[PDB]
Short mmCIF file of C-alpha atoms and ligand atoms in Angstrom, two decimals:
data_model
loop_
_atom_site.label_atom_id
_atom_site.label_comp_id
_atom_site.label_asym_id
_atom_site.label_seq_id
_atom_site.Cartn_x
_atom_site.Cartn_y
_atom_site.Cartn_z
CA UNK A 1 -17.99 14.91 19.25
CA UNK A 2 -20.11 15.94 16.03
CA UNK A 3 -17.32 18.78 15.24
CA UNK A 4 -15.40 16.34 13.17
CA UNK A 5 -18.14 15.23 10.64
CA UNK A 6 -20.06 18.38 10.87
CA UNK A 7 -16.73 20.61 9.22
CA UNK A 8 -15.48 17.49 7.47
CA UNK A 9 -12.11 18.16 8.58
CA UNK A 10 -11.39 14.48 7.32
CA UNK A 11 -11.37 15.35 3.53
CA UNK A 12 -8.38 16.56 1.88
CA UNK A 13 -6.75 17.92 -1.60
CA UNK A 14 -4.06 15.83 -3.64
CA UNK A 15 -1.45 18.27 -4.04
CA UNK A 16 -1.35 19.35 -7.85
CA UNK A 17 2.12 17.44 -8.24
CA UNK A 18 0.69 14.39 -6.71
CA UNK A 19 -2.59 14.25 -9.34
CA UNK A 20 0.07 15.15 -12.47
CA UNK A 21 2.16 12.45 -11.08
CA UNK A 22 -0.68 9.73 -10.66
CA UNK A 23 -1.48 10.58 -13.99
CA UNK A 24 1.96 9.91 -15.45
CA UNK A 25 2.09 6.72 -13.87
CA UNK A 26 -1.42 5.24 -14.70
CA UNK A 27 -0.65 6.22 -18.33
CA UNK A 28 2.59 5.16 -18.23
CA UNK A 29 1.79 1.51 -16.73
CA UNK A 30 -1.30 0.64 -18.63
CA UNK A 31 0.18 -2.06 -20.52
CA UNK A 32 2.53 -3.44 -17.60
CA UNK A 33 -0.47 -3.19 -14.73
CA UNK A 34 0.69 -6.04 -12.52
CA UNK A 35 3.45 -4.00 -11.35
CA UNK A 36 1.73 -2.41 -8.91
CA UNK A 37 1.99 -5.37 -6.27
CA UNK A 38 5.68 -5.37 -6.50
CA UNK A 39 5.80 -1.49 -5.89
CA UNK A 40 3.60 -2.41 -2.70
CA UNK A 41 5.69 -5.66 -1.73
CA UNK A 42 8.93 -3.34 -2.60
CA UNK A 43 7.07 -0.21 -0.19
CA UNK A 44 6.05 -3.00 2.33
CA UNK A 45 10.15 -3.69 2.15
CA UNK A 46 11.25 -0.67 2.99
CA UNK A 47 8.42 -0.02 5.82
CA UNK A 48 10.20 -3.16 7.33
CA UNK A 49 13.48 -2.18 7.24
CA UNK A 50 12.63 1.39 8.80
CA UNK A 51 10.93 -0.24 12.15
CA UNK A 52 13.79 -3.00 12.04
CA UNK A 53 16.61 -0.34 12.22
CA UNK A 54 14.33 1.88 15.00
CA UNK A 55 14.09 -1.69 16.93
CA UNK A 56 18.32 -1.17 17.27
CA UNK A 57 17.88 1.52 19.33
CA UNK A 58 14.51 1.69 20.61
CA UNK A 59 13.77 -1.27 23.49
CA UNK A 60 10.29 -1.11 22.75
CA UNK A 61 10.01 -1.05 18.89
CA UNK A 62 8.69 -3.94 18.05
CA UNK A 63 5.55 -4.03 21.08
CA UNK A 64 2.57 -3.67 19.44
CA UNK A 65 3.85 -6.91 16.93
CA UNK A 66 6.84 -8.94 17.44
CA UNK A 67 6.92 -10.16 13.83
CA UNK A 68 8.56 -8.67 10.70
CA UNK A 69 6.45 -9.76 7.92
CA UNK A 70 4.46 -9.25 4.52
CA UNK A 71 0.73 -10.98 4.15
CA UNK A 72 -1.03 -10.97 0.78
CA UNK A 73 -5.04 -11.60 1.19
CA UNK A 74 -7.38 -12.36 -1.51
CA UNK A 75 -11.22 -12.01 -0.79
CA UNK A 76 -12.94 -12.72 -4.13
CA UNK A 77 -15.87 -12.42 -2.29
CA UNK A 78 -16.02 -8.86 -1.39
CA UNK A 79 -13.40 -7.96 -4.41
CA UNK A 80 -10.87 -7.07 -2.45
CA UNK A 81 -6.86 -7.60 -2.18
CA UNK A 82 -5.43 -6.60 1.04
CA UNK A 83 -1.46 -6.70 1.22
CA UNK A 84 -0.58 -6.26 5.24
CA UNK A 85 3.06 -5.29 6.52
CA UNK A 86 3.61 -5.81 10.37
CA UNK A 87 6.58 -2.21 9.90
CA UNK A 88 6.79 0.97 11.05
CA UNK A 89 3.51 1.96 9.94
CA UNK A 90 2.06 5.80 9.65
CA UNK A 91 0.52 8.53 12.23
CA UNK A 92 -2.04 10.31 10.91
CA UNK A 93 -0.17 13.10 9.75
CA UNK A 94 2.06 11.02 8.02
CA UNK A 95 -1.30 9.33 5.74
CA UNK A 96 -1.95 13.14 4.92
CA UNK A 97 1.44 14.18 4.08
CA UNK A 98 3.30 10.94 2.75
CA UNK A 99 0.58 10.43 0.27
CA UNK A 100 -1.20 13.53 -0.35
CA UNK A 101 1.80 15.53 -1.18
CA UNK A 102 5.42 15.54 -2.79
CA UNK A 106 13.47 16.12 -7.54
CA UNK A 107 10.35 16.39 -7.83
CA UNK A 108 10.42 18.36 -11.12
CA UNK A 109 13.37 16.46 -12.85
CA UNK A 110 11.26 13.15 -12.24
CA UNK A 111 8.52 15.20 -13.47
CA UNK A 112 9.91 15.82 -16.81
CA UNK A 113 12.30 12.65 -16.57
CA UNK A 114 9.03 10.89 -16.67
CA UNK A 115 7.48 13.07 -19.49
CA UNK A 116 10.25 12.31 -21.74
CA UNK A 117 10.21 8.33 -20.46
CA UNK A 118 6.84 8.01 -22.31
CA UNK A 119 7.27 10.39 -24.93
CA UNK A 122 10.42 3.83 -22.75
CA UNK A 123 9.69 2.23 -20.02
CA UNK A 124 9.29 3.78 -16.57
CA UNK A 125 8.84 0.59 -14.05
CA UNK A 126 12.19 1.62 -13.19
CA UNK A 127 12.09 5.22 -12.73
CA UNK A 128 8.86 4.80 -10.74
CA UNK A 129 10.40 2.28 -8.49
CA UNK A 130 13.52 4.19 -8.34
CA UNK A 131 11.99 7.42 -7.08
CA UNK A 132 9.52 5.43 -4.99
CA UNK A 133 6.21 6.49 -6.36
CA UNK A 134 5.14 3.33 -7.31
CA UNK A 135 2.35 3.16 -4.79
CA UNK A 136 -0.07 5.11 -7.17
CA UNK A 137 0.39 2.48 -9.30
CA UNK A 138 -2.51 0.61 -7.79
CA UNK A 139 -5.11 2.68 -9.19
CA UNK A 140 -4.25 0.99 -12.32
CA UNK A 141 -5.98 -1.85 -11.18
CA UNK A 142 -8.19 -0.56 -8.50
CA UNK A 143 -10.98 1.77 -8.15
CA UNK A 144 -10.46 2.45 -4.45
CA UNK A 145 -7.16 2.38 -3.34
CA UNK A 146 -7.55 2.03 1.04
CA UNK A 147 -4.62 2.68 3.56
CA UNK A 148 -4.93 1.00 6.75
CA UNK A 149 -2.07 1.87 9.32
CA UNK A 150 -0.66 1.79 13.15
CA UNK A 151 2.41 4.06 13.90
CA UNK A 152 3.94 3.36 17.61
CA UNK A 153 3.28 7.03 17.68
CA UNK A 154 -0.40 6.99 17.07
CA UNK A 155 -3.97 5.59 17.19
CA UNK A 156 -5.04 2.80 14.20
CA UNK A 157 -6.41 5.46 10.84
CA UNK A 158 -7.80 4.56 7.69
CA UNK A 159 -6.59 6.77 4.90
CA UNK A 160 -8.95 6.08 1.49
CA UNK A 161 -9.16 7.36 -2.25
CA UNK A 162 -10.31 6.78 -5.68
CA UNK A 163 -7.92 9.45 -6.85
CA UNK A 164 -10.03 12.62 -6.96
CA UNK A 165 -9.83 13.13 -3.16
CA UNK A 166 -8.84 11.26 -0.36
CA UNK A 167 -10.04 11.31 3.61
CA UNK A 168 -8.23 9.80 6.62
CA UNK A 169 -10.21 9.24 9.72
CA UNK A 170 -9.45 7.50 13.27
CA UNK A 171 -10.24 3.48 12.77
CA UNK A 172 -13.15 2.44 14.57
CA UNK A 173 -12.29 -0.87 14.74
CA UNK A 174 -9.48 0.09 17.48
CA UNK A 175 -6.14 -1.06 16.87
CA UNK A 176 -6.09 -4.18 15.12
CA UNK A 177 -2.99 -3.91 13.37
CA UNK A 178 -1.10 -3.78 16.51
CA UNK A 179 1.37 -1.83 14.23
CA UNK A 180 2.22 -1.93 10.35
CA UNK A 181 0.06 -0.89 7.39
CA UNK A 182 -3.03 -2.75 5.31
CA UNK A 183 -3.01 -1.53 1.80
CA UNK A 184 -6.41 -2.43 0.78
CA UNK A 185 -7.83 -2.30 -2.84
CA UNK A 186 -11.10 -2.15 -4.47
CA UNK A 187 -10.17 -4.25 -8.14
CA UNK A 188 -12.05 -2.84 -10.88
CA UNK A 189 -14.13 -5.15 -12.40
CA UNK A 190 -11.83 -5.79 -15.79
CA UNK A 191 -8.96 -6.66 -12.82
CA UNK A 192 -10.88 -9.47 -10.80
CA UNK A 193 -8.02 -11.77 -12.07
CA UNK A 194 -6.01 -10.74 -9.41
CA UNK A 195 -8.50 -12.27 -7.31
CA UNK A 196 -7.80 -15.59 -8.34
CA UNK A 197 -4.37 -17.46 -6.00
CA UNK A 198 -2.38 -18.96 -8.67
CA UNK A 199 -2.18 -15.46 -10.04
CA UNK A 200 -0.79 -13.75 -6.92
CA UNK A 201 1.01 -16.17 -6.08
CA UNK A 202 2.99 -16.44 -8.89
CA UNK A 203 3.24 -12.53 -9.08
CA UNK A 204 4.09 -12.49 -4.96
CA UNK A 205 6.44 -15.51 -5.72
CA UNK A 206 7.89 -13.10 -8.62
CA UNK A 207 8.12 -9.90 -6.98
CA UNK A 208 9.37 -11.09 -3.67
CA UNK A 209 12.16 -13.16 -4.39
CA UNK A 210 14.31 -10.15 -3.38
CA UNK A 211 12.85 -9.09 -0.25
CA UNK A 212 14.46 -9.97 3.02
CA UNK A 213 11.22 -10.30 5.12
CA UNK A 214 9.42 -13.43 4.68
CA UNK A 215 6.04 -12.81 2.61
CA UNK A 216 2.88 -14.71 2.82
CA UNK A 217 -0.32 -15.42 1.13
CA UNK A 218 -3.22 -16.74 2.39
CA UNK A 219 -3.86 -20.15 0.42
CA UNK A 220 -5.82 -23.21 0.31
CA UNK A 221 -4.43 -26.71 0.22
CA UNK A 228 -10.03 -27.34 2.07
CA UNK A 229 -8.17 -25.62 4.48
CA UNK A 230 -6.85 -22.32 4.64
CA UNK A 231 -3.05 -21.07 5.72
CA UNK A 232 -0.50 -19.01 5.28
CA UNK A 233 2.27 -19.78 2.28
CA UNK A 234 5.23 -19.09 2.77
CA UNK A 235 6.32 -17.01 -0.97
CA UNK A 236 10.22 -16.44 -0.98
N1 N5O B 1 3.38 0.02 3.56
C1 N5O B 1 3.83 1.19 3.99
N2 N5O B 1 4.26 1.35 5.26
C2 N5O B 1 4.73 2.51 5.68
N3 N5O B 1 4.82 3.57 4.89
C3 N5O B 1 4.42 3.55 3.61
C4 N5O B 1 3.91 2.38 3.07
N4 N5O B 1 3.58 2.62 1.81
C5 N5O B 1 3.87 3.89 1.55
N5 N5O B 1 4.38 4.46 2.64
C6 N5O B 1 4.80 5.88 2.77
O1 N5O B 1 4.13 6.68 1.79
C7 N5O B 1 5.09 7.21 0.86
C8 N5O B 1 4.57 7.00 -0.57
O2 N5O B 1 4.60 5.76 -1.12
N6 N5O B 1 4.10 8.05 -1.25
C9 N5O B 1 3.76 7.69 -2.63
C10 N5O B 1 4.76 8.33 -3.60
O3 N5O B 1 5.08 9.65 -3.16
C11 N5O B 1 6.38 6.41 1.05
O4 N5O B 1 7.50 7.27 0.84
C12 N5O B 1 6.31 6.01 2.52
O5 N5O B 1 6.83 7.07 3.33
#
């Protein structure tokens, strides 16, 4: 089973549109960077609602995880923020395609002209705020479990990204693990008070309960909204 590594088969192209757009957004965002946890929270959201309405009519939706919920993960230790959603998650096609590829042209310009304002609407509007994480990270790493599929790990620093079968089996039972590498200037977002009072911000609107894991020393789950 050498094939795989051998071709690389793993490593893929961002679509043109897709490096123009990260662009935009990183350039756009530079002075409003935290808003890249609420565009996760807010994709987390709608990853939620998507396995919540498929659990309506599907009997065995919900399997591999019977909760619904959002957990927010600090590791100062390794520099690392993980933000884990127990939804519908992604196969591996849908790593590939969903976030390697792309009104595409109106938000295009709409965007253009938005700079030449602000655009932490327009970006959340149109959905595309998940780039927005390379403002404050380096490596930007995609955990996820689709009912559909085996566990893959989907990873980037925004020149070229690679998915790949987990190795560590299926641990997420199902959802998605949006895992970031914080550049060194962003280690602030480390810290708990910080999240937490972004999380606390940014999730006051969300209809799944979202946690982060805090100390009172021992460690636990807070509840956030
Ligand atoms: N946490 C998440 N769970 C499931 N799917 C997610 C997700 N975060 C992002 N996605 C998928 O990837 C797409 C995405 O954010 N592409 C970036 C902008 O085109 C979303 O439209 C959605 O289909």
């Amino acid at each position: 089973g050498s094939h795989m590594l051998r071709e690389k088969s793993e490593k893929f192209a961002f679509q043109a549109e897709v490096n123009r757009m990260m662009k935009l957004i990183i350039n756009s965002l530079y002075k409003n960077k935290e808003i890249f946890l609420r565009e996760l929270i807010s994709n987390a959201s709608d990853a939620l609602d998507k396995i919540r309405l498929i659990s309506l009519t599907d009997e065995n939706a919900l399997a591999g995880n019977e909760e619904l919920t959002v957990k927010i993960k600090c590791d100062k230790e390794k520099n690392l923020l993980h933000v884990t959603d127990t939804g519908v998650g992604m196969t591996r096609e849908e790593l590939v395609k969903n976030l390697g590829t792309i009104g595409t042209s109106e938000f295009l310009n709409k965007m253009t002209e938005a700079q030449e304002q602000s655009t932490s609407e327009l970006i959340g509007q149109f959905g595309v705020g998940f780039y927005s994480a390379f403002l404050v990270a380096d490596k930007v790493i995609v955990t996820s479990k689709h009912n559909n599929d085996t566990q893959h790990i989907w990873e980037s620093d925004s020149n070229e990204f690679s998915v790949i079968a987990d190795p560590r089996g299926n641990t997420l039972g199902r959802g998605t693990t949006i895992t970031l590498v914080l550049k060194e200037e962003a280690s602030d977002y480390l810290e708990l008070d910080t999240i937490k009072n972004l999380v606390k911000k940014y999730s006051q609107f969300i209809n799944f309960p979202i946690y982060v894991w805090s100390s009172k020393t021992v460690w636990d789950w807070e509840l956030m909204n």
